[PDB]
């Protein structure tokens, strides 16, 4: 309607510029993104069709929304400015001083919106026909060199962000010298602060990864970055390092299938002790990796000796024999294992895409190294309570402090299990499934994940989950159909598998028809897990087949949480379609089992799943309230267990709430 209105009735509405923009301003202030869509499109069409004065008033209103409004308002107005500069740069070039006016308020804007603001300004500046209007081009160069020349970290952050995004947009022979000067100056001013240099490496890595830009500049920068990396950390593999250390410093965690009389080694611990530049190892390797992937089209034959190297480390592996000599050596050790795991995570991020089988064996050895150093680090944090290094309690360290893996690292997940007790191990699978669950939870209900769209992640997981985690599901059913710690691990892997299943199938882009084709292929994995041959079947037949496959896991389930996840998965599948008796019978079975404790919220959720789906709520309540009585008579624990003296409160609360409802 709005396109037809503003395309036909543009001469009539040209009177009422101010009323239209007042309505747009009143609509942008609210929630409900369908409203804010209309608030954006009103500005868009008003800029599209009206006169130059109304265009100036539109830009004024947008800068008013940015400089004043809240996060949704700033986001929407910046999206609108991006759409208008990509639509009409020549119209915005008349009003570009008003867009320059946002540089007064950089102390009020979030760093993501700083990225977006610098992007829109620097794509406005660097159109080819507007090189007669070079005033903005010199002015923003000036303000970047001004921002970078401050000692304060909050200004240096904005300077680094603006420098990287500006170099990225201007890098699509003298322009090569220009980006050379800019990158050299940001590298020179960002050299001294470690936190600034880390952010610089991260931003430059994100730029090289996300954007395809003019490979002559990449060819220029790669010879710089590779050489600075190979002289920065890489030393000779002589067994005695420099530095008077009170520690048996060795070259640990080699692969030992590589040639041990090689030159490439890593001077990590002497650099870390000479610090007290080693905190910038992982992002710099990410940068080098990305430059080589963009140059040689993913061929890492220049690097692939680097995952063979040991690391010059203290003998870490016992953290019990050196107990109660608590000192700064504990902080040294915990930060050492921290940097080791970050480096190993970046290696695993690097060489997961490669298809060579011995490289996959090396990456699996790196994963075993990751999980064993994770055990040593959690032991070190167990003995040393509060001395935590913040480098940009286990729940805190799990998500934010470590490096974030890619999505293609779960291409490891195609390899099968080798259970060590019955005869890719269990705990590395636990690690991978924990990571994938923690990603899907944040994405569908984490920086490099969020530049990928949720549709892209759901699309990519469909290949990357179902036909190789169904194998692990079958292996888990086989194991639990048949010493304590491996059971503890494999129970957690089973829980995480069902969690990832539920998080995938409960995705809220399946009401839309465009993703439903993907959903059909999803059912084509689940229906074809028992028997094939029935192809191009109706949707409800695939649903019945999938739930019939999913139902017979119920005897193998070793804990309450996996049962709850299974019933929520069955419910969120069966709602795509009588089945209330199925859900009720399953819930009743899981309420009736022994469960060798159980948190009250799990049992609350299972009881509200049971009572809403039964045939009669009233006779169900009368059933449980002729069981609530023989809990007192017989047991000093009932004939309907998980109804202890503790869990009576939860049973009562659910019964009262559900009777009232």
């Amino acid at each position: 309607l709005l396109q037809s209105t503003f395309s036909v009735h543009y001469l009539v509405l040209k009177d009422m510029c101010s009323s239209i923009l007042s309505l747009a301003q009143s609509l942008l202030h609210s929630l409900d993104q369908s409203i804010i869509s209309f608030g954006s499109l009103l500005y868009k069409y008003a800029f599209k069709f009206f006169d130059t004065y109304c265009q100036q008033e539109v830009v004024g209103a947008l800068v008013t929304h940015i400089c004043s409004g809240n996060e949704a308002e700033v986001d929407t107005a910046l999206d609108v400015l991006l759409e208008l500069v990509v639509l009409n740069p020549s119209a915005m070039m008349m009003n570009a001083v008003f867009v320059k006016g946002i540089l007064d308020y950089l102390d009020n804007i979030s760093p993501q919106q700083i990225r977006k603001l610098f992007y829109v300004l620097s794509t406005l500046a660097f159109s080819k026909q507007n090189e007669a209007s070079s005033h903005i081009q010199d002015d923003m160069h000036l303000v970047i060199r001004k921002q970078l020349s401050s000692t304060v970290f909050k200004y240096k952050l904005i300077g680094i962000i603006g420098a990287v995004t500006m170099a990225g947009i201007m890098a699509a022979d003298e322009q090569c010298t220009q980006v050379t000067s800019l990158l050299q100056l940001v590298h020179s001013c960002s050299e001294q602060s470690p936190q600034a240099s880390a952010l610089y490496y991260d931003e430059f890595a994100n730029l090289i990864q996300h954007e395809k830009l003019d490979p002559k500049a990449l060819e220029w920068v790669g010879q710089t970055i590779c050489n600075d990396f190979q002289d920065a950390f890489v030393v000779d593999s002589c067994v005695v390092p420099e530095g008077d250390f009170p520690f048996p410093v060795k070259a640990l965690y080699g692969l030992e299938e590589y040639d041990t009389q090689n030159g490439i080694a890593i001077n990590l611990l002497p650099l870390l002790f000479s610090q007290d530049s080693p905190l910038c190892l992982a992002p710099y390797f990410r940068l080098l990796r990305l430059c080589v992937e963009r140059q040689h089209n993913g061929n890492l034959e220049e690097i692939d000796g680097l995952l063979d190297c040991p690391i010059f480390l203290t003998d870490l592996e016992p953290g019990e024999k050196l107990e109660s000599m608590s000192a700064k050596e504990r902080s040294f050790m915990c930060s050492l294992i921290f940097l080791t795991l970050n480096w190993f995570r970046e290696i695993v991020n690097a060489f997961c895409q490669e298809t060579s089988p011995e490289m996959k064996g090396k990456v699996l050895t790196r994963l075993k190294h990751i999980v064993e150093l994770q055990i040593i680090l959690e032991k070190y944090l167990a003995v040393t309570p509060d001395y935590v290094p913040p480098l940009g309690l286990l729940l805190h360290n799990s998500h934010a402090f470590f490096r974030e893996l890619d999505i293609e690292v779960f291409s490891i997940l195609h390899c099968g299990l080798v259970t060590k007790f019955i005869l890719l191990g269990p705990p590395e699978l636990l690690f991978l499934l924990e990571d994938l669950s923690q990603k899907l939870e944040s994405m569908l209900t984490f920086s490099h994940l969020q530049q990928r769209s949720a549709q892209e992640i759901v699309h990519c997981v469909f290949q990357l989950l179902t036909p190789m985690c169904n194998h692990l599901e079958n292996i888990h059913n086989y194991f639990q159909c048949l010493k304590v710690q491996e059971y503890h691990i494999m129970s957690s892997c089973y829980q995480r598998l069902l969690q990832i299943f539920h998080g995938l199938f409960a995705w809220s882009g399946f009401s839309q028809p465009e993703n439903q084709n993907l959903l059909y292929s999803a059912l084509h994995v689940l229906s074809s897990r028992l028997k094939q041959g029935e192809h191009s079947q109706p949707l409800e037949e695939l649903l019945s087949q999938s739930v019939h496959y999913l139902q017979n896991f119920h005897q193998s389930i070793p804990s309450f949480q996996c049962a709850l996840y299974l019933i929520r998965l069955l419910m969120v599948i069966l709602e795509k379609s009588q089945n209330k008796e199925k859900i009720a019978s399953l819930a009743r079975q899981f309420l009736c089992r022994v469960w060798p404790n159980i948190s009250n919220d799990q049992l609350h959720a299972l009881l509200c799943i049971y009572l809403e789906h039964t045939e009669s709520i009233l006779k169900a309540i009368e059933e449980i309230a002729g069981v609530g009585v023989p809990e007192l008579i017989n047991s000093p624990s009932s004939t309907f267990p998980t109804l202890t003296r503790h869990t009576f409160v939860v049973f009562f609360r659910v019964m009262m709430a559900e009777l009232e409802k």
């Binding site: 008013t64 004043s68 409004g69 308020y105 102390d107 009020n108």
Partner: protein, 316 residues
Amino acid sequence: MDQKILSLAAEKTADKLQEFLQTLREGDLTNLLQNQAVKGKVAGALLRAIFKGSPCSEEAGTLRRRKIYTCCIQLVESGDLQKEIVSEIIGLLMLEAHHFPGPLLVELANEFISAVREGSLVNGKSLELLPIILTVLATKKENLLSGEECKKQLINTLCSGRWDQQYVIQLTSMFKDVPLTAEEVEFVVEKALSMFSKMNLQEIPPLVYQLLVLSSKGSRKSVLEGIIAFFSALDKQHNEEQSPSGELRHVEGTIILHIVFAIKLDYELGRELVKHLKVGQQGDSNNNLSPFSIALLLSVTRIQRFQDQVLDLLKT
């Protein structure tokens, strides 16, 4: 005598420079005031040869470092030197304050607090060392009382004693760069609000500006309460004198404009201003507003986000 130190900082370190300090041993006051009088360039180059020549690993270098710091703090206050060489020597004192042990900085800070007690501070560039040292005291968590407790007693000695009336605003410019706790910013703003009475009026607005950039990292309610209550009291004095306008109304308008332009950069300050001057229950509105706070609100009405809330507050 300058040409026999430039050959000492060039070849090697500590083997020849450490004996030159103990052999001279007479005076470091006449040898720094008079070489600047002919050519000021020979002093900044001398400092990178004495300071590189006196590390903090040994004690006799540390005492010489304390001595050279004391005599260069005295000369930048005493001498009517050029602003260029002053900026250079303050720059070298900025670049060479990173690696100090505990007990020397507290004595240098004692000389600093002694200067804020009595001494004629014609240039506040001498107290520019006082920001950064309270940072480097805080990073040393070891008994010199730890660093933070010595920092607390230091700020207490600054706040408790009388503030030198000509340069009170200058000391307020020093707490902007130091990190403080909530109790520390609360103490420094209650001292800064206590010092409003014993001044001329027209230095109050930029000191208010020096408060607001401090108020961005601490308590804003105390600063706003003190400013509003103080100028409301002065308005009451002017009205009972009426029953003195052409400066008091001017300084009021200037302060209003300053804190509106500070609210323009810090919306948390604006939201706490709207909260503080709320009517709410009918008993607060018989003490809240004033002929100064109403003008302040009607100037806040210039800011686009605060147009609705402030006019709805004044209407109700």
